Design a binder for these strands. Sequence first.
RNA 1: UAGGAAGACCGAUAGCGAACAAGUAGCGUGAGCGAAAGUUUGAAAAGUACUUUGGAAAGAGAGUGACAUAGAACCUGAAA
RNA 2: GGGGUGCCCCCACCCGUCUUGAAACACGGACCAAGGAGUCAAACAGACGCGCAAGGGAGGAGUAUUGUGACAACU
RNA 3: AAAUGGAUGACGCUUAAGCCCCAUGUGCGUGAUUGCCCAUUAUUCCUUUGGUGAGGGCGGCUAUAUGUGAGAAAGUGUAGCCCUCCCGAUGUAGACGUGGCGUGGGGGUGAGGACGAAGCCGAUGGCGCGAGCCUCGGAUGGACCCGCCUCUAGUGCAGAUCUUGGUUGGCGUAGCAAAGAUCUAACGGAAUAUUUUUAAAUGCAACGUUGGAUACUGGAGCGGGGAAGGAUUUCGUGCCAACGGCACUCGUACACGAGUUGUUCGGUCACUGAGCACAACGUUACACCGUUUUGUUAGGAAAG
RNA 4: CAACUGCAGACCGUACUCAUCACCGCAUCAGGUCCCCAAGCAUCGAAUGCUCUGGUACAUAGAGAAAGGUACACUCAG
RNA 5: GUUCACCCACUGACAGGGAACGUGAGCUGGGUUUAGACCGUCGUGAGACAGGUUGGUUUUACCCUACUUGGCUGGAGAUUG
RNA 6: AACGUGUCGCGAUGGAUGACUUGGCUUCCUAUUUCGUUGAAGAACGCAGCAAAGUGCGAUAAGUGGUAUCAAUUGCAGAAUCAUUGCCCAAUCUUUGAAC
Lengths: 107, 150
Amino acid sequence: RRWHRKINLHQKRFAVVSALAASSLPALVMSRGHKIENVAEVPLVVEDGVRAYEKTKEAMTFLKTVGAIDDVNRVNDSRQIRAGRGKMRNRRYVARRGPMLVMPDNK
Amino acid sequence: YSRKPQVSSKTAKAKIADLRCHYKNTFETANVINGMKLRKAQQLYRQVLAKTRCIPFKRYNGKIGNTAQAKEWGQTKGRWPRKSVVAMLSLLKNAEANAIEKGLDPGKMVIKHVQVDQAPRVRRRTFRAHGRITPYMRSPCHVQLFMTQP
RNA sequence: UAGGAAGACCGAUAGCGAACAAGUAGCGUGAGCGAAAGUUUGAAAAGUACUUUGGAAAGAGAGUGACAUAGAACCUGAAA
RNA sequence: GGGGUGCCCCCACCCGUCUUGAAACACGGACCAAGGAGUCAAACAGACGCGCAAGGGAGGAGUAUUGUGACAACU
RNA sequence: AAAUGGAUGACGCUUAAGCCCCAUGUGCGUGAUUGCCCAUUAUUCCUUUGGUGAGGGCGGCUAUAUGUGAGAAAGUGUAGCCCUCCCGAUGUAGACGUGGCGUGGGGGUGAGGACGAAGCCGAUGGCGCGAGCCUCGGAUGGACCCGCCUCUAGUGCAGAUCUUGGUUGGCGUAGCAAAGAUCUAACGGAAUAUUUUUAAAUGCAACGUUGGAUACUGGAGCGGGGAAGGAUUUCGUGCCAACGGCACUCGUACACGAGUUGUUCGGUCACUGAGCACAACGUUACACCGUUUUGUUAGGAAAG
RNA sequence: CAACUGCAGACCGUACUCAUCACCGCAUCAGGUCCCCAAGCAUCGAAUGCUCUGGUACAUAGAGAAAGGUACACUCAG
RNA sequence: GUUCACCCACUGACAGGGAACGUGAGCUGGGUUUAGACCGUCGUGAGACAGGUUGGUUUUACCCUACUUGGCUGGAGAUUG
RNA sequence: AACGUGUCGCGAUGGAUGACUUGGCUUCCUAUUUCGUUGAAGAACGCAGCAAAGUGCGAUAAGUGGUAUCAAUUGCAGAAUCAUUGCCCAAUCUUUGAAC
Ligand SMILES: [Mg+2]
Ligand SMILES: [Mg+2]
Ligand SMILES: [Mg+2]
Ligand SMILES: [Mg+2]
Ligand SMILES: [Mg+2]
Ligand SMILES: [Mg+2]
Ligand SMILES: [Mg+2]
Ligand SMILES: [Mg+2]
Ligand SMILES: [Mg+2]
Ligand SMILES: [Mg+2]
Ligand SMILES: [Mg+2]
Ligand SMILES: [Mg+2]
Ligand SMILES: [Mg+2]
Ligand SMILES: [Mg+2]
Ligand SMILES: [Mg+2]
Ligand SMILES: [Mg+2]
Ligand SMILES: [Mg+2]
Ligand SMILES: [Mg+2]
Ligand SMILES: [Mg+2]
Ligand SMILES: [Mg+2]
Ligand SMILES: [Mg+2]
Ligand SMILES: [Mg+2]
Ligand code: NA
Ligand code: NA
Ligand code: NA
Ligand code: NA
């Protein structure tokens, strides 16, 4: 059976560009389900000292400072056991999608 | 039990499961004593054994014989089922023993709620012409009753 | 032969014939053919001592357990 | 107002099928539960959606990566 | 002039309820132009649905707290953005449409659950033209599950002399009729001599052993021993759930224990027969082929 | 070499059945299945009938003059 | 084998038809019409012939109705007012 | 009158549905990777205190030996680093079978 698909290279780059622009409008961000009431200046840009953190405690303080902890709490409270046969097939829990953090590399 | 006694402190109950008697015969034998007294029901069973009276067959009468002794019950068909009468006599004796334990007087009890049901069947086989085999099945029954002192 | 990794798959008439003492029980002189069946009671056997009727099987009480219409092919328990 | 059971006056041939024509003295029809039949691949054509346009698009390979990593990015 | 008794549809009708024609309300040689009954037809009114549809509003300043009020979306399609108006509506084979219904799973989003999830039940009603959806009750259950947007498929049953299970009238019916057959007393057994409402008319029927009686097989035997086949059916003690198409206290049934002893019997040791086919040789793409007792293997040096 | 005497004599089978119930016919099925022994009287007799020995009362039974049946059961004037 | 026909007799007379060419889970099975076999004619042959001849399984009712007998028992608002 | 019919409450018969799943099916990867006359694969018979099948084993027969760990095994018995458990070097390995 035909399991995989081909997509034109230009169309794939068009889709990425459109999704990036959609993330810049707070009305579309709230409508998808994210909690951004305490954020300032969407799109949010933070300094580069973040890459030097070594402890998870430091990371959690940074998320609270910029107001991104509400979206993290939304994912935490939504964790639950999946309905149906899927829980027998190695996908037992479901959770929602939270914030993104984009980095210049894998460092 | 399908039904509940009105006064539980003056009632004696008894039941038997998977009794090895024909269900259709026991259905008629047990049904006739509903509403009777305990002593009157025992007397009728003794006279049926002596073949002086008969048990009326009202629902499973099929094509069975006619007799003069069925006129007492207002019909024409009846029989004298030996195995079912003996089994029903044992059940009444157990119910009478239960009443003695509770302190009641067996001479005043009146029978209420006789019920006969079909039990799981038992399978045998018989041999027919041209190399065929057909079922030869047995039909047991469940019986339950109680009786109250007025 | 030893290990590993998985799945937008099937879910006990499905998926291998076989989730079970299954290439077993059984069938055929033979070459060969070939099933049904979840022990899924309960968290724990705590699996009903004892009284009474009965030859026994069992019935009527008593008792364990949150539930015994959860009593042993014992979750739920449809239709004819 | 809805629901259940009975009654009265009126109306009312047995379902599915082949066939010009079935209520048929045409065939299949005891009852219930669970199963049960236009799918996947490959070549071509037309309609409709999307990208680019005298150009469009690759494939195979390769470059960089326990990380949503058999994905995604790049040539 | 014909074959079951029988058809103006039946009864019946003769100052017709028959045949051929003519009329019509209240008042038939004085009201000129509708005596009356019955349609999925015509006119008219209300509602739905679809259009080669036709028009209109949509730049919200009139004024207003509680103890005349709600809406208004620039729109194919929805609980249709709203208000007027016009025209069509049945249909086998067949084509197409639907912000049409329902089922298992993936990506998202939002909830529910031991103060009770799924499943199951219903004189539980409400909503929708409908496929269906939702609430209610359970004197049901005891651990998971759904709304919406999208992606995906082993996605919807009344019939195929359909497949697999279960249930069913017929039905306590058809039958259980070859081989002649049993009776009596005592004992055994829970299977009796069972009555509280004189004795018979209220515990029937049936089982084994022993004695007695009667009878059958009739030596080509329901006698006593073996082969083939079977493989513990043999024996003692116990036992009656299921099985011996009725019965059982009996049993080739079930349970627990026991039993088969050879220098001479049968077989091998230890013979040849109808025959078979190792070795050797030959053939075959390939031995899994052929020859191999008419005194006898092998182009053949087979004697230890 | 003929007598006598002393010692030792290996292995496997061995129960039960062989049939109107132990085998083959889906079964305790009126079918089928090889061999040996074989009494008295009648009589030509291994025909057929009855009997001592041995063996069996096991094959669902009880009550009981309907029609119509089956029978290895009969009789009928002219 | 017949339906039909034709003879012998009796008689008042020995008319003609229908009922799924009445009637096979009522019978019988002579005919017709499988497989065996013989003859004649036809065919190169296997075979053929509405030509002759002989031998050749006749299954099931216990259901509904109809009919024949046999019994039990309601009912006047034909079960109620 | 009974039989028969219909509706509701309760009880039988039967084993569907739901929720569970140490099973199947499909795809991918890694090795000091491939049996036997030094008698294989298969086939038979045996072995436990109580042991029918299955599992393990072979008259050293639910196991002997080495190694790491340490207090269990369990239905009832019974014994008290040495068992059990995992792994593996040294051994035993009945009758057959290419079978010689
Ligand atoms: Mg028979
Ligand atoms: Mg047979
Ligand atoms: Mg299976
Ligand atoms: Mg299978
Ligand atoms: Mg035609
Ligand atoms: Mg039709
Ligand atoms: Mg007709
Ligand atoms: Mg239409
Ligand atoms: Mg699926
Ligand atoms: Mg169905
Ligand atoms: Mg009878
Ligand atoms: Mg004799
Ligand atoms: Mg003999
Ligand atoms: Mg019996
Ligand atoms: Mg013999
Ligand atoms: Mg026999
Ligand atoms: Mg003489
Ligand atoms: Mg003689
Ligand atoms: Mg003789
Ligand atoms: Mg005569
Ligand atoms: Mg006829
Ligand atoms: Mg010629
Ligand atoms: Na579900
Ligand atoms: Na046809
Ligand atoms: Na008329
Ligand atoms: Na020879």
